């Protein structure tokens, strides 16, 4: 016969109020933040992690297109050479070879340049 | 509640408002909403359902409760002290247990924080039979077929 809301009352606010970052002004100090902002965070987060898979790919190719072309054949022709193979197909990501194993990479551009029929 | 008045707050205007009466369920003043009430509570169980499945004790609680002896006839006029003497014929004491002798004699002597209860009589519900460790049926013969009432 006792709601005595006080009992979870606190725990709930405290829960979301637990936004370490503090963000700014009311965004931590006032409960107002939670479903307004802590909620946005959940939303902005929901999409960015999955939308990110590509944002890096866009970078991966951005550099491959910037590395492979300097030594003949553009990114457009590159993957096409690479495309022809029985086992020769190791995708990008590691494609950053242009930063650590340049010799490999340029030795990989021939795997495509000389590969393009 | 102490509604010693009808709405005196002037509706349209005065800035934020919208009040009215004061047994107003929102006004900290008083007024408790969907109030409450004395009610009955007491639900009633059919007659057959009442006698249905009770002393399942014997079989299940076999190695525990289903003892039948005597109502202790030699017990003094009103003496509970040396109850122990008889409380040891089975070694069932504070373990709880209730007797079902069926004689409002002097054996109603059991008075304690909560151990042995008498109620030795037709009047008895399973609730009690199941509240104790080993309900000493006892009584003898009283435990007949359809009238195993203790």
């Amino acid at each position: 016969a006792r709601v005595k809301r006080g009992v979870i009352a606190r725990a709930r606010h405290k829960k979301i109020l637990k936004q370490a970052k503090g963000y700014y002004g009311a965004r931590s100090r006032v409960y107002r933040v939670a479903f307004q902002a802590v909620i946005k965070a959940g939303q902005y987060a929901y999409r960015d992690r999955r939308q990110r898979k590509r944002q890096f790919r866009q970078l991966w190719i951005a550099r491959i297109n910037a590395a492979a072309r300097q030594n003949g054949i553009s990114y457009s022709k590159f993957i096409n050479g690479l495309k022809k193979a029985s086992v020769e197909i190791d995708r990008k990501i590691l494609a950053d070879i242009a930063v650590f194993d340049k010799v490999a990479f340029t030795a990989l551009v021939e795997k495509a340049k000389a590969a393009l029929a | 509640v102490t509604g010693s008045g009808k709405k005196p707050w002037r509706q349209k205007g005065t800035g934020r408002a919208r009040s009215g009466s004061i047994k107003s369920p929102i006004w900290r003043s008083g007024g408790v909403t969907f109030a409450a009430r004395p009610q009955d509570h007491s639900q009633k169980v059919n007659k057959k359902m009442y006698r249905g499945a009770l002393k399942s004790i014997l079989s299940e609680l076999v190695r525990q409760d289903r003892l039948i002896v005597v109502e202790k006839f030699s017990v003094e006029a009103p003496k509970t002290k040396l109850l122990a003497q008889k409380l040891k014929d089975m070694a069932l004491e504070d373990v709880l247990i209730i007797t079902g002798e069926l004689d409002e004699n002097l054996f109603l002597a059991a008075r304690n924080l909560h151990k042995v209860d008498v109620r030795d009589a037709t009047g008895i519900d399973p609730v009690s039979l199941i509240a104790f460790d080993k309900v000493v049926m006892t009584a003898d013969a009283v435990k007949q077929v359809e009238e195993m009432l203790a």
């Binding site: 987060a45 020769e88 590691l94 490999a104 795997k111 | -």
Partner: protein, 103 residues
């Protein structure tokens, strides 16, 4: 020697590096069984013989170490329209470590 392979994402850039991956199947606990990867090898790629393929002869694989296959990570991730809120949700994996011997 370098390393290279896919299996649930091309995660095999680093050489030995001992980095997380996926999960066995029936159960994780550690120990091992000695599972060679496959000749996805960049020919290992590492020496005077960095090779376009990776294909530099038959059979070339590293044995899996099976360092630690556990843990999780927790990420809230909750959507909500203007009238609802699936806000309440959680899905993770353990990504077994694996140190991987030499190429």
């Amino acid at each position: 020697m370098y390393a290279v392979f896919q299996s649930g994402g091309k995660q095999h850039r680093v050489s030995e590096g001992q980095t997380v991956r996926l999960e066995k199947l029936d159960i994780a606990t550690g120990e091992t069984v000695e599972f060679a990867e496959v000749l996805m090898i960049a020919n290992g790629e590492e020496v005077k013989i960095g090779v376009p393929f990776v294909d530099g002869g038959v059979i070339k694989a590293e044995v899996v170490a099976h360092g630690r296959g556990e843990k999780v990570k927790i990420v809230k991730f909750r959507r909500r329209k203007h009238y609802r809120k699936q806000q309440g949700h959680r899905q993770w994996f353990t990504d077994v470590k694996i140190t991987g011997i030499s190429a």
